[PDB]
Every structure is written in structure tokens, then in C-alpha cells.
Design a protein around this nucleic acid. Sequence first.
DNA 1: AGAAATATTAATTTCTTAATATTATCCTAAGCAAGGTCGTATAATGTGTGCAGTCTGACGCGGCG
Length: 106
Amino acid sequence: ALLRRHNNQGDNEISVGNLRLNVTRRLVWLGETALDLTPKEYALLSRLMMKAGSPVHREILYNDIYSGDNEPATNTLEVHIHNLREKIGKSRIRTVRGFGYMLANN
DNA sequence: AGAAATATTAATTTCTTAATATTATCCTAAGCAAGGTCGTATAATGTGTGCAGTCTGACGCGGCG
């Protein structure tokens, strides 16, 4: 409840185009079908959709999926975004060099 | 049943190359404001410190008879 009221502005459903995300139920809906999303990809997608339209920093994402203790040594955020874009479509997740990524609303 | 060891899918770093698109040097041409020099033909021809308040006592020393 807390997380939802603060970040998702109180709403239980994020509606961006054909993407619909129930953050409380952990459910992602491409159009009307359901998607099998790994934990990490779910976290990334959650964050991008909550801050709809506005690019999120790379470091914000890196913290958001990676617990302080287990921090890897190589390219992971990029691969996770790649698979998120493969399961969702290259159009949704636009790349903003230097300052992370952005989910397009328009 | 409550763990307690095992086989599977499955979520996931890790390189790797290529690649792929963005982005940021670079570099020279050119341009514009700024800084430096010349050129002036009525005639014009010598000076300001514009003073300075005796400090001062030996003392050096150059004279100085």
C-alpha cells in the first residue's frame, strides 16, 4: 500500500498504451494477454512505468534491481533491458545515452 | 512429515564482437570587434618642480689657509 501511494501515485494499475501493470498483483498485461517476466525485468518495467515518460537514471535502475550486497562486475542492466525489449517490443523502451532509459508514452 | 539430499527448468552474469547508432573532437576557413600606426600644413619658438622651513650631530673630507 505504501509503495503504491507514493510512487504509483495511489493507483493500483499503470496504463501506458497496451501495457497494463497491476503492481499489487505483480501482473503485466501486453494488450490482453499475460507475459512471463523474470524478477529483474519486472522490477525494471515497474520503475519505468511508474515514472512514466520521464527518463530514469542508469544508477537508479542499477540500485533498484541490484541489492547493495550482490553487485556484479559486468554489463547486466543493458542485457536486462534487451530482454525486456524482446518480451515487450523495441518501440516501448527508448534509449537515452548517458542518462539511462525511458518508457515512451507518446 | 520434516527435513535432506538430489535433478531439472530457469533466471542471470559474463564476455565478445560487431555493431550501431549517437555523439563529440578537430581544424581550418572565415568574420568581426579590438588594438596599433599614420596623417593632418594660419600661425604658433625656453621652466616649472611652484618650492622652503635651517633637526642633527658629529664627522668625513676637501680644502684652506
